[PDB]
Amino acid sequence: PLPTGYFGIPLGLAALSLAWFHLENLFPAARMVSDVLGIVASAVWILFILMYAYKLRYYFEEVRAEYHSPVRFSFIALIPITTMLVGDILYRWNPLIAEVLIWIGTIGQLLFSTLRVSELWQGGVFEQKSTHPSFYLPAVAANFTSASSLALLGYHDLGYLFFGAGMIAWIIFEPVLLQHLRISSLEPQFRATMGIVLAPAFVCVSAYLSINHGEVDTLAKILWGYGFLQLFFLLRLFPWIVEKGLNIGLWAFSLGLASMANSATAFYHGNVLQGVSIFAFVFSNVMIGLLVLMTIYKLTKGQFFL
Amino acid sequence: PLPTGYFGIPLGLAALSLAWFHLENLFPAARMVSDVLGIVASAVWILFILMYAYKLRYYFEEVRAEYHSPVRFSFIALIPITTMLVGDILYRWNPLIAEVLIWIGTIGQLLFSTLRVSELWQGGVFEQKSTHPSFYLPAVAANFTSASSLALLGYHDLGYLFFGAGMIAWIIFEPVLLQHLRISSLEPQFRATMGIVLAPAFVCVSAYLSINHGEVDTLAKILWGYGFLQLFFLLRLFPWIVEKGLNIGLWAFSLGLASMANSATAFYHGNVLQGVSIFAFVFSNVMIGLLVLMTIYKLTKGQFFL
Amino acid sequence: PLPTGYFGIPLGLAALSLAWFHLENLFPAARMVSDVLGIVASAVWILFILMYAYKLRYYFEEVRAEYHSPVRFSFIALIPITTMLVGDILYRWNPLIAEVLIWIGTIGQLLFSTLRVSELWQGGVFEQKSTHPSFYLPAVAANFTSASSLALLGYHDLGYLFFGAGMIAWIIFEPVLLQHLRISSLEPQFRATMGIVLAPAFVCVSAYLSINHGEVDTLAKILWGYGFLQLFFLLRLFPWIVEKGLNIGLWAFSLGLASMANSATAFYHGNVLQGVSIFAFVFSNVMIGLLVLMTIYKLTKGQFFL
Ligand SMILES: CCCCCCCCO[C@@H]1O[C@H](CO)[C@@H](O)[C@H](O)[C@H]1O
Ligand SMILES: CCCCCCCCO[C@@H]1O[C@H](CO)[C@@H](O)[C@H](O)[C@H]1O
Ligand SMILES: CCCCCCCCO[C@@H]1O[C@H](CO)[C@@H](O)[C@H](O)[C@H]1O
Ligand SMILES: CCCCCCCCO[C@@H]1O[C@H](CO)[C@@H](O)[C@H](O)[C@H]1O
Ligand SMILES: CCCCCCCCO[C@@H]1O[C@H](CO)[C@@H](O)[C@H](O)[C@H]1O
Ligand SMILES: CCCCCCCCO[C@@H]1O[C@H](CO)[C@@H](O)[C@H](O)[C@H]1O
Ligand SMILES: CCCCCCCCO[C@@H]1O[C@H](CO)[C@@H](O)[C@H](O)[C@H]1O
Ligand SMILES: CCCCCCCCO[C@@H]1O[C@H](CO)[C@@H](O)[C@H](O)[C@H]1O
Ligand SMILES: CCCCCCCCO[C@@H]1O[C@H](CO)[C@@H](O)[C@H](O)[C@H]1O
Ligand SMILES: CCCCCCCCO[C@@H]1O[C@H](CO)[C@@H](O)[C@H](O)[C@H]1O
Ligand SMILES: CCCCCCCCO[C@@H]1O[C@H](CO)[C@@H](O)[C@H](O)[C@H]1O
Ligand SMILES: CCCCCCCCO[C@@H]1O[C@H](CO)[C@@H](O)[C@H](O)[C@H]1O
Numbered sequence A, B, C: 001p002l003p004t005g006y007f008g009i010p011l012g013l014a015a016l017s018l019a020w021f022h023l024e025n026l027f028p029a030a031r032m033v034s035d036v037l038g039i040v041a042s043a044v045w046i047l048f049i050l051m052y053a054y055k056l057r058y059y060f061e062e063v064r065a066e067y068h069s070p071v072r073f074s075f076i077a078l079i080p081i082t083t084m085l086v087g088d089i090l091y092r093w094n095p096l097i098a099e100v101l102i103w104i105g106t107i108g109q110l111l112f113s114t115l116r117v118s119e120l121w122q123g124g125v126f127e128q129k130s131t132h133p134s135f136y137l138p139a140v141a142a143n144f145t146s147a148s149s150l151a152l153l154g155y156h157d158l159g160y161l162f163f164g165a166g167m168i169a170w171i172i173f174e175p176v177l178l179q180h181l182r183i184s185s186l187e188p189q190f191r192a193t194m195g196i197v198l199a200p201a202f203v204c205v206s207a208y209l210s211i212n213h214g215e216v217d218t219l220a221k222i223l224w225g226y227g228f229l230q231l232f233f234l235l236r237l238f239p240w241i242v243e244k245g246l247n248i249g250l251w252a253f254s255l256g257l258a259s260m261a262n263s264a265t266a267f268y269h270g271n272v273l274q275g276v277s278i279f280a281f282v283f284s285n286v287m288i289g290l291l292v293l294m295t296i297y298k299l300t301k302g303q304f305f306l
Helices: A004-021 A030-058 A060-068 A072-090 A095-116 A118-122 A133-152 A156-183 A188-211 A218-241 A248-269 A274-301 B004-021 B030-058 B060-068 B072-090 B095-116 B118-122 B133-152 B156-183 B188-211 B218-241 B248-269 B274-301 C004-021 C030-058 C060-068 C072-090 C095-116 C118-122 C133-152 C156-183 C188-211 C218-241 C248-269 C274-301
Strands: none
Touching: A004 A030, A004 A072, A004 A248, A004 A274, A030 A060, A030 A072, A060 A072, A072 A095, A072 A133, A095 A118, A095 A133, A095 B218, A118 B156, A118 B218, A133 A156, A133 A188, A156 A188, A156 B156, A156 B218, A156 C118, A156 C156, A188 A218, A188 A248, A218 A248, A218 C095, A218 C118, A218 C156, A248 A274, B004 B030, B004 B072, B004 B248, B004 B274, B030 B060, B030 B072, B060 B072, B072 B095, B072 B133, B095 B118, B095 B133, B095 C218, B118 C156, B118 C218, B133 B156, B133 B188, B156 B188, B156 C156, B156 C218, B188 B218, B188 B248, B218 B248, B248 B274, C004 C030, C004 C072, C004 C248, C004 C274, C030 C060, C030 C072, C060 C072, C072 C095, C072 C133, C095 C118, C095 C133, C133 C156, C133 C188, C156 C188, C188 C218, C188 C248, C218 C248, C248 C274
């Protein structure tokens, strides 16, 4: 079927729904915006889940190949990540169904990493050229997503465990990723995944603020600072990133963008850097809006599905 | 003599004695268990120290070779680490003798790293293939051990310095270690040392809780989360680790296991994740119990000493 | 002109002026010492700025080459760093002019890194052999300097953003730097830059204490611990560092030394490790004093300028 990376679309939309949700008491109309984005993300997730179920049943060898690949395996983590985010959305309407989805996605991502990420340490399969930003998905983003989802359900201390796993995994991987990028020019076909480099600090602070009841403290400010540094670097790099043209892979940026938006709501609520917060929230919405527009355009030309 | 790595045996036993010690007021019988493990660890340490003194006097070129090796040097750090842990045990009976051992081990480990770990930065001796988990011993575990031992003696601020040295050294080394493991299959003869990968987060949180008066805070929960992630990964990898058979090298795991047990006592005392704490404490005791049983078995067959 | 690295001289002197400044209320005579060092640093900075302006106008291709070099570009960051430090000095006399310099240096360093540090991620220019301690200048030291300068002006939350950018950039680069040093013997002509390895933890804690109102907390103690570990390692390595002779490049050490001095004033004020603080402050002053003496000597022999 469907390329596994397309789960980035409901991921980005779902995460953006949750960001707007957190503005509802400052600005009541934010709830309708959140509900609309959340319904659209959920519908797209349902479709993509059904399509992936079909892939498993009738194209299993494609799934097997992607699973055993030391690079492509990572995109599978998008499935449980999006499952948890849809759970977080649904919590506003039905906490029971939300909790089921959150546990399925949590157990699923932990099983996934435990099976596949650890296996890499056997050596001889992963190569230096396998050192791609997509590795953040199973290693980092999945753990932060479990952290914030478990906090939503009231399991704050368990959430902190998943939080720590993601934060330390991030700091442990990024050094070798950035060195690899410096030495080796990432080929155009993979370059859109540079957008995932935006994610770690913003997804980290978003998850942190979810678990710590929105307390904007020293750690949060530290994370925002490195997050904005990476944003500036990626903005400068953008023309290089899209050297060979705009493409649907640019949804890679939506994880970081939506988390910039979510964290910005908490900085704003805490009266920390409110002007920066407004900029971050507007910027991220405009960019995801542009992703949506370019996606509708592609669907319009029959250039969406493979 | 005696392979230097055999100091891992009294290390694991001593650390486990200290874990049980910290349960004595919740469960008084824990003290007898702690005292027994502590006496056995101390007796084994005495024997191994005397044997290593004999190695220094009559097999000095073997010591010299191990010292100058960019891989084997690390195991020497087990000597001052175990010396400090025996000091921590003895403190319950004789604080004066305890303090002497703790300072000997602290000054010894710091001198050792200052001489040998820094020397590696001259280049040309350490190679990519030298990137082994054993490096954590002089670089990380030795500093955490000094931190907690100095805290025991009431030198908390000095303990925090050693703590920071170990924590930042850990985060600075692990990125390149895990990348190396991914690319290069660690040969079977070294694979038991994968057990040292369990140690950092647990030894870190154990030392931290020792210095901060057992306050189970955000940092502690973060460390436990990454610690359990690594545990799960190593459990999945275990059949690969022991591909060529069970061996005495598996005492490599005891450092992390004993620190899981120790930290679990503090999480339990703090009423944080008590169910996880009970599991961690029981699991680690069972695994170290299995190490002891397999060791008695080897001694029984005359397959212990070289 | 003038080698760009010579900006390390007013950098080291300016930073040391700020350290003495922070003793003025414990020891009033410290103010005169601070004022003298600050005037000398400012005068040297003025001279070097004018000389670099001349280089830009009449030797532009030399500047272009250094800018595009994946190793030599880093020294350019010394210009905005020193500009901010001179601003911090001048603040005691004229806060308006100080603020102008601080914003010029902040915007300048951020623009510099955004343009050049990010560009490295395109690959194919930076090589493994490009992995030099000088990279800390644009990546780490510049951000910490902005953090503390902005805090001086009362912009603490913005300062925390720059702080986080520098701290996380540090932890992200150092792993690959130390692995490179282990494997590859850094050639003598670059070895004096090993002194920059002293800087990160001390510049970090100095900036942190500037933003957090001098509160010597757990993070501060942790940073000092790793800072002293690196000091000990570099002391052991010093004879290797200067294998081919003493040279003006040794001003590389002044960044870390001056930050040891500055942070020591805050530990002393906070009654934390006062004995260590006194040692650190005296040691760093003696070493920078020796740099000054060797520099006067070189100027005396006409061996200073190229
Ligand atoms: C999201 C789900 C991804 C799962 C991919 C599973 C990869 C399976 O792996 C395969 O399992 C087979 C049995 O069915 C074995 O024959 C093979 O040895 C093994 O390659
Ligand atoms: C998102 C949900 C993911 C869980 C899917 C589990 C599929 C793994 O399946 C297992 O993986 C092993 C290697 O890692 C292989 O031995 C086999 O394919 C199988 O044992
Ligand atoms: C590589 C990752 C960087 C980690 C930075 C951790 C910073 C922790 O910082 C701590 O936060 C508390 C709340 O504001 C403060 O009260 C403490 O005094 C402060 O040190
Ligand atoms: C998380 C970032 C998005 C938050 C949106 C805030 C936009 C509101 O804008 C603000 O409204 C204030 C009062 O409500 C006015 O006082 C401010 O001047 C104005 O900037
Ligand atoms: C635990 C103790 C380990 C110490 C190992 C010391 C390594 C000594 O090193 C050697 O010292 C000799 C002198 O005795 C010199 O001749 C040699 O140059 C040097 O290799
Ligand atoms: C656990 C106690 C350890 C301290 C032992 C110190 C032995 C080091 O000895 C020194 O090491 C140098 C290289 O690193 C060599 O020059 C020589 O062997 C010697 O100078
Ligand atoms: C790479 C290493 C990860 C470091 C994580 C540091 C987390 C510090 O976290 C801090 O702990 C305090 C105590 O609970 C809190 O009050 C602070 O608000 C919290 O930020
Ligand atoms: C550090 C982990 C080991 C701690 C051992 C705890 C085992 C005790 O077990 C517990 O006893 C409680 C009261 O004492 C009972 O109320 C609990 O239900 C029970 O789980
Ligand atoms: C501190 C200031 C450093 C700036 C160095 C600038 C490097 C300029 O770069 C050059 O700019 C030229 C135009 O002037 C172009 O022709 C070139 O493509 C480009 O190499
Ligand atoms: C300390 C103040 C530094 C700011 C100087 C900016 C000089 C950069 O100039 C730019 O750099 C690009 C590559 O990175 C090149 O395209 C060109 O030289 C130019 O566009
Ligand atoms: C790789 C970088 C290491 C980061 C270490 C972060 C330590 C944060 O530590 C926090 O500091 C506060 C102030 O003292 C305390 O109250 C917290 O309880 C303590 O955890
Ligand atoms: C930051 C490190 C430099 C601080 C300099 C301190 C030197 C003063 O020295 C100290 O003076 C005290 C009272 O003023 C005496 O009581 C102490 O015994 C003495 O050590």
